[PDB]
From Swiss-Prot:
Signal peptide: none annotated. It is found in: Cytoplasm. The lineage of its organism: Eukaryota, Amoebozoa, Evosea, Eumycetozoa, Dictyostelia. This is Heat shock cognate 90 kDa protein. It comes from Dictyostelium discoideum. The TPR repeat-binding motif mediates interaction with TPR repeat-containing proteins. Belongs to the heat shock protein 90 family. One of its GO terms (molecular function) is ATP-dependent protein folding chaperone.
Amino acid sequence: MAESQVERFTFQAEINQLMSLIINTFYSNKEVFLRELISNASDALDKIRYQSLTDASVLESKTELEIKIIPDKTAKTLTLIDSGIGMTKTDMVKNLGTIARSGTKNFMEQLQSGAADISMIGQFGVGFYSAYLVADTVIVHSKNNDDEQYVWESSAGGEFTIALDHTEPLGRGTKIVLHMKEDQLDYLDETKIKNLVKKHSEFIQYPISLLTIK
Ligand SMILES: [Mg+2]
């Protein structure tokens, strides 16, 4: 019998409102979700790479600096794995929903008015939540050199959980798994996702591997 300690957290009020707005509103073009996944991976890779310039030992946990993208139609998931800096448990708590972001209120105001559209979400410091444009549930597995591997999960509804993760060790970095909404499954089509990755990785300075499940 397996045992797991799970901790529940509540999203900061405006983040919760943003998630509701992202989930319960129609958006014609949701491609920004992929831009934001890749950008977060690139930022995490930069962070560990620059740390390695001043402390080479930080790469011992995983020498490669790369991104892997895995569309899986049977599972109805899109997965993106980076070997960036990773998040400790408290990093997840602080960065993935409990702490207010300066731009959340202003973004929602500009969405409501028409001053901004959904593609601009990254400019407002809340890009991560774009995953909920296309996914019902988001699962974030992460391993930072300073902590054990943890998994964050949320289907929105105002809460998320974090638990120790005993699934496939990452060595270092982050694996984000999007459980795709029925009406967004086209994003798992081989040519569609290949093109989207090309389009949204033009200036990315790390190798990307894109799988297709036969
Ligand atoms: Mg980001």
